[PDB]
Amino acid sequence: SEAEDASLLSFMQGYMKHATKTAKDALSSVQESQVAQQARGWVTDGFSSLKDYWSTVKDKFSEFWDLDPEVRPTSAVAA
């Protein structure tokens, strides 16, 4: 017995509702968190390379707002 009115959105709607349960069992599986050593890895590769790039982008995020005297999707992409 089930409401035939419910559209094909039923199975899904509930799916995410139910699959959200696996979060726990899946959460405990976070054992992949050990990825630390990996992160602590990028250090050797001079992860610092993120600073310059970060310090720029982030900071440039201020100016990156105001484009040339002409803010158009055409000239921008084409230039």
Residue written as token pair 């979060």: 23
- C-alpha 45: how far from chain center: 24
Q: Are 67 and 76 in contact (CB under 8 A)?
A: yes
**Largest distance between two CA atoms of the chain:** 65
Helices (H), the chain: 9-19, 23-28, 36-42, 49-60, 73-78
Residue written as token pair 């054992």: 31
CA distance 12 to 1: 18
SS3 call for 37: helix
User: Structural domains in the chain?
Assistant: 1-79 (6.10.90.10)
CA distance 38 to 47: 11
**Technique of determination:** NMR
Residue written as token pair 């899946």: 26
